[PDB]
C-alpha cells in the first residue's frame, strides 16, 4: 500500500505525455549543419476527459443506533463550503476522509 | 399442529431492495379479560363540562394497533429512510397471530 494512501498498482494508469511539435522560424538561404535555435513561439490548448469506473462495496451492518456520517454545517455562514467566493475562487475548507461507517473486527 | 408444536417463528427484520423496504416486526402480547366479559354503556354522567360530554360503549374486546412508525422501523432503519429518500409510502402489509 502506498504510504501516502491509495492503491498500490504494479501496472498503474500510464503516463500521458504531450508536447508541441517544433515549428522552425525563417532559415537561412545558405545551408548550415547546425541545429535550429529559432522557432515560432506557440502554445496549445484543448479539452481533456477522464472517465474512471469504480466498484463499490455496500454496507451490511446490523448496528442499531445511527452511525457517524459526514454532514455539512446547516448554520448561517458568509460562504457556503466547497463553493466559490465573491471573486469566483473555489476553495476546499477541510480534508474529507473516507472512514465514517463502522465494521466490527 | 397440536399443543407441543410451534405455530410460527420470530420474524423481526428489515430487508432493503432497490426501491422497496420490507420491515417485519414481532412482539409478545398479553390479553386480559375486559369488563368481565360485558358490554358497558359509558358516558359523562359523573359531571363533565359541555365540551367534555361523551356517550359510548366499552367492549370486552382487545384490538391490535401498529399505527406508529417505530413499530416497524428501528432508529437505524429510519435513518436509512430519511437520509436517502425523497419519498415513501406503504404498499402491502401482512399480519400474524
Swiss-Prot record, chain B:
Disulfide bonds: none annotated. It is found in: Virion; Host nucleus, Host nucleolus. It comes from the Viruses. AAV capsids serve as viral gene transfer vectors that have been shown to affect long-term gene expression and disease correction with low toxicity in animal models, and are well tolerated in human clinical trials. The ratio at which VP1, VP2 and VP3 proteins are synthesized in vivo is about 1:1:10, which is the same as in the mature virus particle. Capsid protein self-assembles to form an icosahedral capsid with a T=1 symmetry, about 22 nm in diameter, and consisting of 60 copies of three size variants of the capsid protein VP1, VP2 and VP3 which differ in their N-terminus. The capsid encapsulates the genomic ssDNA. Binds to host cell heparan sulfate and uses host ITGA5-ITGB1 as coreceptor on the cell surface to provide virion attachment to target cell. This attachment induces virion internalization predominantly through clathrin-dependent endocytosis. The N-terminus of VP1 is sequestered within the mature capsid. It contains a phospholipase A2-like region and putative nuclear localization signals. Belongs to the parvoviridae capsid protein family. This is Capsid protein VP1. It comes from Adeno-associated virus 2 (isolate Srivastava/1982).
Amino acid at each position: 500500500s502506498p504510504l501516502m494512501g491509495g492503491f498500490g498498482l504494479k501496472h498503474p494508469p500510464p503516463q500521458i505525455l504531450i508536447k508541441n511539435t517544433p515549428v522552425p522560424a525563417n532559415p537561412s538561404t545558405t545551408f548550415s549543419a547546425a541545429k535550429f535555435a529559432s522557432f515560432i513561439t506557440q502554445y496549445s490548448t484543448g479539452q481533456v476527459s477522464v472517465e474512471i469506473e469504480w466498484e463499490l462495496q455496500k454496507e451490511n451492518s446490523k448496528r442499531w443506533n445511527p452511525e457517524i456520517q459526514y454532514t455539512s454545517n446547516y448554520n448561517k455562514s458568509v460562504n457556503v463550503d466547497f463553493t466559490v467566493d465573491t471573486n469566483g475562487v473555489y476553495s476546499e475548507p477541510r480534508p474529507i476522509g473516507t472512514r465514517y461507517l463502522t465494521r466490527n473486527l | 399442529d397440536g399443543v407441543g408444536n410451534s405455530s410460527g417463528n420470530w420474524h423481526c427484520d428489515s430487508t432493503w431492495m432497490g426501491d422497496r423496504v420490507i420491515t417485519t416486526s414481532t412482539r409478545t402480547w398479553a390479553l386480559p379479560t375486559y369488563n368481565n366479559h360485558l358490554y358497558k354503556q359509558i358516558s359523562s354522567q359523573s359531571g363533565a363540562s359541555n365540551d367534555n360530554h361523551y356517550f359510548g360503549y366499552s367492549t370486552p374486546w382487545g384490538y391490535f394497533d401498529f399505527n406508529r412508525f417505530h413499530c416497524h422501523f428501528s432508529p437505524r432503519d429510519w435513518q436509512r429512510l430519511i437520509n436517502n429518500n425523497w419519498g415513501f409510502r406503504p404498499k402491502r402489509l401482512n399480519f400474524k397471530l
